[PDB]
């Protein structure tokens, strides 16, 4: 029983490194992507002053 | 008897897979998905029929 219940507990609480590593990888990319977009957006208004203020 | 019982179960599993497999609720292997055309052309009529049997 112990062995079986430990297995069940793992299926419910234990983490799957493969899927979790994947999400960490995906998270980092989306972060780097957003940061780049943010940087470009932060410069959007910089176009306005080009119109002689 | 045991083997028959075992297969009895697999038989049901096959039926389940058939009456559950779906591409967004459009059951695919139960038969309900008969020949459906896929317009793969920029103009009308340029389609290809796909048939999923039971």
């Amino acid at each position: 029983i112990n062995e079986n219940v430990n297995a069940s507990k793992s299926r419910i609480k234990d983490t799957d490194f493969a899927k979790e590593t994947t999400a960490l990888t995906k998270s980092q990319i989306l972060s780097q992507a957003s940061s780049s977009v943010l940087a470009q957006a932060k410069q959007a208004p910089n176009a306005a002053l080009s119109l002689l203020g | 008897v045991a083997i028959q019982e075992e297969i009895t179960a697999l038989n049901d599993e096959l039926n389940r897979i058939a009456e559950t497999t779906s591409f967004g609720g459009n059951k695919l292997l139960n038969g309900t998905f008969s020949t459906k055309s896929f317009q793969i052309g920029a103009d009308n009529g340029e389609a290809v029929m796909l048939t999923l049997k039971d």
Binding site: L30, A33, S36, V37, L38, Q40, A44 | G24
Partner: protein
């Protein structure tokens, strides 16, 4: 010509500029989000099927 109460050429510029700025925003959003159909405005049908697939 030689008028000082109308600059239709300028008006045209703004019109195109606006269109460009709008396009920039939509792309930026898609890039930052990672999804093309963010709002249903992008694709009413896409949202419908994507949500059900999700």
């Amino acid at each position: 010509a030689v008028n000082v109460n109308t600059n239709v050429a300028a008006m045209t510029a703004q019109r195109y500029l606006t269109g460009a700025t709008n396009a920039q925003q939509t792309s930026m959003e898609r890039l930052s989000s990672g999804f093309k159909i963010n709002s249903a405005k992008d694709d009413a049908a896409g949202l419908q099927i994507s949500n059900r697939l999700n």
